[PDB]
Amino acid sequence: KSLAKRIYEAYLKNFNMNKVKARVILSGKASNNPPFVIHDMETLCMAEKTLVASVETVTELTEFAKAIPGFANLDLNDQVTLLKYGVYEAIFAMLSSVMNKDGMLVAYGNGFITREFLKSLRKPFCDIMEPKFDFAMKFNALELDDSDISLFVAAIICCGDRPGLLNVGHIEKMQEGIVHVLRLHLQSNHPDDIFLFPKLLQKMADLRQLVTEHAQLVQII
Amino acid sequence: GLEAIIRKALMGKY
With beta carbons less than 8 A apart as the criterion, state whether A147 and A185 touch. Answer: yes
Q: How far apart are the first and last CA of chain B?
A: 23
Residue A80 to residues A32, A93, A110, B3, B5: CA-CA distances in angstroms?
A: 43, 20, 31, 7, 10
With beta carbons less than 8 A apart as the criterion, state whether A164 and A81 touch. Answer: yes
Instruction: Give every strand in the sheet of A36-38, ordered side by side.
Output: A36-38, A111-114, A103-106
The domain segmentation of chain A, as residue ranges, is: 1-221
Q: How far apart are the first and last CA of chain A?
A: 47
Write out chain B residues lying below 8 Å of A68, CB-based.
none
Label each residue of A79-133 as H, E or C: HHHHHHHHHHHHHHHHHHHHECCCEEEECCCCEEEEHHHHCCCCCCHHHCCHHHH
Under an 8 A CB cutoff, do A59 and B7 touch? no
Describe chain B by its helix, strand, coil percentages, rounded to 5.
Answer: 55, 0, 45
Chain B nearest-CA distance from A55, in A, is 7
d(CA A12, CA A18): 7
d(CA B4, CA A196): 36
- Out of 3.40.50.1820, 3.40.50.300, 3.50.30.20, 1.10.565.10, the CATH code matching A1-221 is 1.10.565.10
Contacts of A100 (CB under 8 A, 6+ apart): A26, A140
Beta strands per DSSP E along chain A: 36-38, 103-106, 111-114
Residue of A nearest to B9 (CA): A59
